[PDB]
Each structure stands twice: as structure tokens, then as C-alpha cells.
Amino acid sequence: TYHLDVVSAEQQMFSGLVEKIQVTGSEGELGIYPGHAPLLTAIKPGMIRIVKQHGHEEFIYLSGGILEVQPGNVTVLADTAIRGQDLDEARAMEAKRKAEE
Amino acid sequence: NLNMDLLYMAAAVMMGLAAIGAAIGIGILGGKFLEGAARQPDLIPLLRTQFFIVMGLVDAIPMIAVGLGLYVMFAVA
Amino acid sequence: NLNMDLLYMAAAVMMGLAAIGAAIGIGILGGKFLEGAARQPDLIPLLRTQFFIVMGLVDAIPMIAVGLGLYVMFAVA
Amino acid sequence: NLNMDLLYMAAAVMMGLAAIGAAIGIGILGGKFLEGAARQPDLIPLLRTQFFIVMGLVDAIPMIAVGLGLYVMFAVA
Amino acid sequence: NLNMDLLYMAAAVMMGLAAIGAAIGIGILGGKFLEGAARQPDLIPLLRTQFFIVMGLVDAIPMIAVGLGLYVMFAVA
Amino acid sequence: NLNMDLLYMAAAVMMGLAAIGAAIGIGILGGKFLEGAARQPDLIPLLRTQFFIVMGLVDAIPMIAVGLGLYVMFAVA
Amino acid sequence: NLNMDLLYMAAAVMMGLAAIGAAIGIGILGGKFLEGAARQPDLIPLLRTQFFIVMGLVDAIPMIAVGLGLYVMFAVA
Amino acid sequence: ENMTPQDYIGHHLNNLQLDLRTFSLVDPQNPPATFWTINIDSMFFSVVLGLLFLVLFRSVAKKATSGVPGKFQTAIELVIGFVNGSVKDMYHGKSKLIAPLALTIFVWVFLMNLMDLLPIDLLPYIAEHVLGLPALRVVPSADVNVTLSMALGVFILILFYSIKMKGIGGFTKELTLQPFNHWAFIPVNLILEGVSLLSKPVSLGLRLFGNMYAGELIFILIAGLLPWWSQWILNVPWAIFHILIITLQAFIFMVLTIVYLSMASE
Amino acid sequence: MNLNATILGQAIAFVLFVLFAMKYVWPPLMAAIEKRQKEIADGLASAERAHK
Amino acid sequence: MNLNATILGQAIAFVLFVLFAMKYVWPPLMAAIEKRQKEIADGLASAERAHK
């Protein structure tokens, strides 16, 4: 079957051969099977669930990321957080005021 | 005698055209609804409600057509 | 005289075509409306208003045709 | 006989074809309008103004047939 | 007499076909224009110009067909 | 009586079919041209020039159809 | 001799159907040709040759129909 | 009373035409075949509406201040802003003609269409009984002439702009060369350009006439055919629709006039 | 047909239409009220701000 | 329906209305709102110049 990778910029989360997966695509829930055509999509926060070789069930929660598919390879480029709120612009203000004070 | 005979063709054309129009419109709407339900299975009770809201507008004229076809076939004959 | 029979046929053709158009155009519009409501389920009251806005434009000529067919069938014949 | 009923049938042809064309074209236009409004829910007035331009352009020519059919029915026949 | 009476039906057929063709073509064109203006809102005046350019090409044959039908129904009839 | 009348009928059906074909073909071609313009607005001067060439091929045949219809109407009478 | 009048109608229907088929087919082909030229503008002279090769096939039956209708219209009638 | 609905519909579709030559009131039963018989009903209501428009706009313009705006002045300031914004959206030239022309077109066409909402028999019954006029129909827009006169005036304005701003040389150049630009197509180019040019104002006028005529006839049929107790259930859903119809049609006429003038000039 | 009955039914329908228009087409003046509020408030506040 | 010389009298009425409206009607209007906008803008400009 295909070889599933789950990785982040900080760490490798999972690696192994996988028979099928369930993953929440950008526009809706998606299932991947061996020999799937090349596909690229972001993934919304939630559970991605996996069956390894011999159909052993594995569940992984993701804050988000990008899912893509290649011949024999599935790679999930997960990230730490949603990041959509952009509250850290406030964090950048104090760096300026403390430099001015 | 043609006053009796021709009325059946006038109803036949009406009940063919009304059926073609209603079938094509309901098929397109149902196809869109099915695709939306397939993508978003959680929203099925909402999409079904909106589908039944919209479908009553499609049938408005074809049902007038079919009722008048029945009238022409039976009452006036 | 035999002349009365053709008026029914003409009204039949006019109303059948009016129903074909009124069904198919409304079906396409409603299918697009449902497709757009599936994506953004919170925008249904606005999309539903705009759908009515365009749907009023859609069926107007079919409404004219249907009314004229009713007139031809009942008042004239 | 041949005078009035052929005029009625001609008017029915005019105002069935005009209804078919106008309904289908306006449905096609409104589908793309409603699709655009779901992508950019803010730009709705601008897109609906452009839709009004196109809707007028579409509606202009079927109304010729509609008015001429009304003329043929009442003034002529 | 039948000779002139059928001319009204001939003009009806001609202008109904012209109206359906023009309405459907302009509807498709306007739908593509609306979608384009929905993808690039800043570009609308250019696309609108292009749309007018192509619409002047589309309507010419339906316009002359309707004009000739009007000719046959007024000057001839 | 019915020779010239049928001549007009044949011209009517001919020109209606020609107008239908021209309108639909130019609508499809212009819709795809509009989409290609929308994708790359700066390329419009080239795509428009190619669309004109293709639209000439589109227009080639409905114009001989319309010319023969005008010949039938006016010259043959 | 009534023989002459039916031949004009027989030529007219043939040429109108040929015009409809050829114009819609050529519009469909040219629309994809224009979209492909929009995507890869440097390949246009190759796509033009391919488009001409394909267009030579689309007009096979329509040009035979147009020739035969023109033959019927003049030589036979 | 004794009447055939066919004749009731017949009377309503007739006009107080009056002979210009002999000054004689035409009657609906027998129409003469003389060209110069002005159709008085539509024109009489039509200029009255223009007078009301001019009177109201002057009555507000004569007092408006930049201070606290009144409740009455606000509607006129809003309509002026709407027309000005549409013009500025679709016209960039210096011509002072365009904006007041569009404003007049919009307001006058809106006023003409509004007459259709009124009860179909009220004013005609008044005119027949109290006055004695043989015929009357009160929606000016339903007149083909009012529509065609306005469309032909707009076409004259388009020709003037093409000759002056666009240029007569720039008009012959466009007519001959465009859209195919080759001398082989120039005869074809002239025909296509002329056909489209004449198609535009005919489309405007006949679109407006078709809308108003096909709303008025629907109201007349509803009145004539259905029994009184049942008329409301089909009359009311139609007037609500026709309000949007008349607003949309006045907006379409104004905006399309603006578009045609801007394309002719620039 | 009786013409009086037609005048009765047209009056009924016009009454109902007037009521519907007044309770559903008139309110846009409420939207027009926001323009008045905005104009008055912004003009007065901005003139005061400039002078101060 | 039936064309008539009404096509001409309305052509007189239309041009007369257009001329009268073009001359008298438009120029007085739209001045007041522009004056409001200019007052707000120039008060802001003057106040900010004095602030600088």
C-alpha cells in the first residue's frame, strides 16, 4: 500500500505504510485509497484516522495543515495552530513601545 | 367529429411538454441537492428543507398544464 | 363550424412551451441556489432573497403566456 | 375559419418560443450571478448591477415577440 | 384569405426562432461575463466593454431575422 | 395563391434556423473568449484578434443561408 | 405545376439544419481552442493547425448538405 | 349591466385619438385610417408627470441648505446622489448634458410606469362619465410612441456624440474597418455596425413598451375575467411584482442610455 | 357582464395592494433616515472639532 | 399596435422638457451636498494645518 507521512516543522509525527485513511479536506471529508490520483488540499482542524497494514486503527488530531497525495506516498504537512486570528500583531506593538520608552 | 378527436392531441402535447419540463427541472435541482448532501452530510436536513422549498416553485406551471390537460381530456372531451 | 378546435391546440402549445421554460429556468436557478447555500449555510436568508429577486424575472414571460393561454381556452373558445 | 385560428396559432408560436428563450437565458444568467454572490458576498451590488445590464440585454428581444404576439391576437385577430 | 393569413405564421416561426437563439446566446455570454467580473471585481469596466463588443456580433443575425419577420408581417402583411 | 405564401414560409424557416445556429455558436465562442480574457486581462488584445478570426468562420455559413433566404423573399417573390 | 414549391422548402430545411450543426460544432471547437490559447499563448500557431485539422472534419457532412441543397434549389427546381 | 369581456378588453386597449386636421374625437368602435390623429390619453398623462417632476425638483432646489437637512429634501438629495454616482461610474467626460438627461429619463420613466399600479377603471370611468371622453388609458409608458420617441432622441444624441466627440472620421473608420479591419470585410462591417447601432435604441424602446404593455394587459385581463370576490388573490401578487418591475425598468433605461452615450463618446 | 362588480373587485384589490405597499415598500424611508442621522451628526461634530 | 402622429407631438414634448431641465433644473441641485463635503474637508484640512 501507500506510505503515509505525518510531519510538522518541529517533528515527525508518524511514518508508515497505510491501507486507507479518513481525512477532513478543505471542502469536505475525504477518503484516500492506494493508487489515488495526485491531489492537493488544505485540511481543517480535526481528527485524521488511519488504518495501518493489517487494518490496525490509529487516530491523530491535527490543528490543521496541508494534505497532498503522490503515487504511493501520502504526506500531511500539519502545523501547530490555526493562526487565522493573528493576535500576535498586538504582541508586536509592545516591542515597539518598549523600544520607544 | 374533429371537435372530439383533436382535443386528445391538444391534451397529449400539453401533458408531454409539462412532463418533460418538470422532469428536467426536478432532475437538475435534485442533482445539485444530491451533490451538496454528498459533500456536506451534516447539512442534509437543512438542504432537504431548502430543496422542498424551491421544488414547489418548479411544479407551479407544469401542474397547471397537467390539470388543464386532464380537463381537456375528460370534461370537454 | 369546426374552427373552435384549433384554438385549443394553439393554447395547448403556448402553455406547454411556457411551462417548459418556467420549469427548466427555475430548476437551473434553484440548483445554483442550493449549491451556494451548501457552501455558506449562514447566508441562506440573503441568497434566498436574491433567488426570489431573479426568479421573479425568470417566469414573467411564462406567466404572460400562461395567462394568454387561459384566455384563449376559456374566454375565446 | 382559416383566418382567425391560424393567427391564434401564430401568436401561440411567438409567445411560446419567446417564453422558452427568455426563461432559459435568464436562468442561465441568474445561475452565474448567484454563484458569484456566494464567492464574494460583499460585492453583491456591483455584480447585481452588471446582472441588470445583462438581464436587460437578454430581455430586450423576446419582448419584441411578446408584444407582437399580443398585437396579432387582439388588433389583428 | 389563406395566402396572406399564413404569412403571419411564417413570420411567427421566423421571429420565435430568432428570439430563442438570441436569448440563449446572450444568456450564456452574460453568465460568463458575470463569473469573470466576480473573479476580478476591479476589472469590470474592461470585461463589460468586451461583452458589448461580442454582443454586437451575436445579435446581428437575430436582429436582421426579427426585422425581416416584421417586414413580412407589416409591409407584406 | 399559395405559391408565394409557401415561398415566404420556406424563407422564414431557413432564416430562423440560420439565426439559431449563428446565435448559439457565437454565444459559445464569446463565452470562452470572455473566460480567457478574464484569466489574463493583459492578453486580451491577442485573444480578441484570434476570436475575430474564429468568429469569421462561425459567421461564414449563416450568412449564405440568410442571403439565400433574402433572395427567396425578394427576388423570387 | 406544384412540383417547384416543395423543392424550395426541401432545400431550405436541409440548409438550415446544416447551418445549425456546423455553427454549433465550430463554436464548441473554437471555444476550447481559445481557452487553450489563453492558457499557453506561445503554442497558438500549433493549436491553430490542430484546430484546422479538426475543423476540416466538422464541416464534412454540413458542406455536403449545403451543396446538395443548393443543387436542389437551382438545378432541379 | 350587459357586456362581453372581449369588448371590455377592447375598449381599454383603445386611445382618445383626436384628428389634428379636423379636431374631431375618434371613437373606439370605428377607427379611421388617417395618420395624423394624436393619441391624447398617453401624452396628456405623460407631460403632467413631467410637470410634477419639474415642480417638485424646483420646489426643493429653491430652498435646500447645507445645514440640517429636512425629511422632504432628503429623498431628492438621495436621488440626485444616486444618478450622479451612476453617471460618474459610467461616464468620465466633461459634457454637462449627460447627468441631467439621465436624471430626467429615470424620474420621468419611473413616474410614467407608476400609473399602472392605479386601479385600471378608476380614471377611465371618471373620464367617460363625468367628462364624456370616448376613451382613455392612463399609463403613458404603455404607448409605443412615447417609448420610440425617447429612444430615437437618445439615438440622435448618440449620433451627435459620435460625430462630435468621437468624430466623423473616427465614425467612418470604425464603420468601415471594425470589427474585422480588412477591406474584404468592410462591406460586411458596415452592415453589422449599422444593424447593431439601430438595434440598440429599438431594444431600449421596445423593451420598455413590452414591459408596461404586458403589465397593463395583465391587469385588464384580471379585472375583466375574474369575479369581484376572487380578483384580489391574483391582482395583489401581481402589483407587488410590478413595483419591482417598474423600478427595474426605469433603472435599466437610465443605465443603458448612460452606457450607450459613454460608448459613443469615449 | 356587470361593470359595477368589476369596479368593486378592483377597489378591493387596490385597497389590499395599498396596505401591502405601505407596510412593506414604504419602510425604505427608514433606510433613508440613516442618511439624515449621519449627515447631521458628522457635520456638526466635524465643524466643532475643526473650530476647537 | 398602431403607429400615429403621436410620435411627433411627444417628440416635441420630450425635447422641450430636456431643454428646460438641462438649463434650469440640474445646476442648482447637487451644490448643497458638495458644499457640505467641502466644508467638512476644508475644516479638517485647516485644523490639521494648525495642528502641524
At E64, which CATH number?
1.20.20.10
What range does the domain containing G34 cover? 2-76
G77 within 8 A of G4, measured Cβ to Cβ: yes
Distance from CA of C19 to the nearest CA of D (A): 9
Sole residue written with cell 456580433: E57
B24 within 8 A of B58, measured Cβ to Cβ: no
- Helix (H/G/I), strand (E/B), else coil: J29: coil
Deposited resolution, Å: 3.5
Phi-psi domain of F5 (left: phi exceeds 0; alpha: psi -120 through 50; beta: other): alpha
Q: F5 CB near a chain E CB, below 8 Å?
A: yes
C4: Cβ contacts below 8 Å, ≥ 6 apart:
B3, C77
The residue count for chain F:
77
- Please tell me which residue in C14, C59, C62, C69 is annotated as part of the active site: C59
Q: Which residues from E are below 8 Å from D58, CB to CB?
A: 23, 26-27, 30
Determine the Cα–Cα distance for residues A48 and A6; give it in Å rounded to an integer. Answer: 10
End-to-end CA distance of chain C: 12
Q: Which three cell numbers stand for residue J47?
A: 485644523
Distance from CA of D39 to the nearest CA of C (A): 9
Q: Which residues from C are below 8 Å from B62, CB to CB?
A: 19, 22-23
F41: Cβ contacts below 8 Å, ≥ 6 apart:
E40, E43, E46
Distance from CA of B37 to the nearest CA of A (A): 11
H177 within 8 A of H186, measured Cβ to Cβ: yes
* F74 burial level (CB within 10 Å; 0-12, 13-18, 19+): exposed
Known catalytic residue at H203: yes
Long-range CB pairs of I23-26, under 8 A, 24+ apart, other chains included? I24/H240, I25/H243
Q: F1 CB near a chain E CB, below 8 Å?
A: yes
What H or E segment, with its residue span, contains residue G63? Answer: helix G60-71
For residue E68, CA distances in Å to D20, E63, E74 come to: 21, 9, 10
> Distance between alpha carbon J17 and the CA centroid of its chain, in Å?
15
- Answer positive or negative: Cα dihedral of D23, D25, D30, D32: positive
* C15, C18, C22, C28: CA torsion to nearest 10: 130
B21 within 8 A of C15, measured Cβ to Cβ: no
Name the residue facing C36 among D16, D35, D44 (closest C-beta): D35
- Helix (H/G/I), strand (E/B), else coil: I26: coil
Determine the Cα–Cα distance for residues E14 and D70; give it in Å rounded to an integer. Answer: 17
The type of residue at A56 is H
- Domain count across chain G: 1
Known catalytic residue at F5: no
For residue I34, CA distances in Å to B41, G13, H74 come to: 42, 63, 11
Q: Which three cell numbers stand for residue J30?
A: 447637487
- Helix (H/G/I), strand (E/B), else coil: A7: strand
Question: For F57, which residue in chain G has the nearest alpha carbon?
Answer: G26
Neighbours of A57 (CB within 10 A): 8
| Residue A37 dihedral angles phi and psi, to the nearest 5° | -65, 155
| Residue A36 dihedral angles phi and psi, to the nearest 5° | -60, 140
F13 within 8 A of G16, measured Cβ to Cβ: yes
B60 within 8 A of C14, measured Cβ to Cβ: no
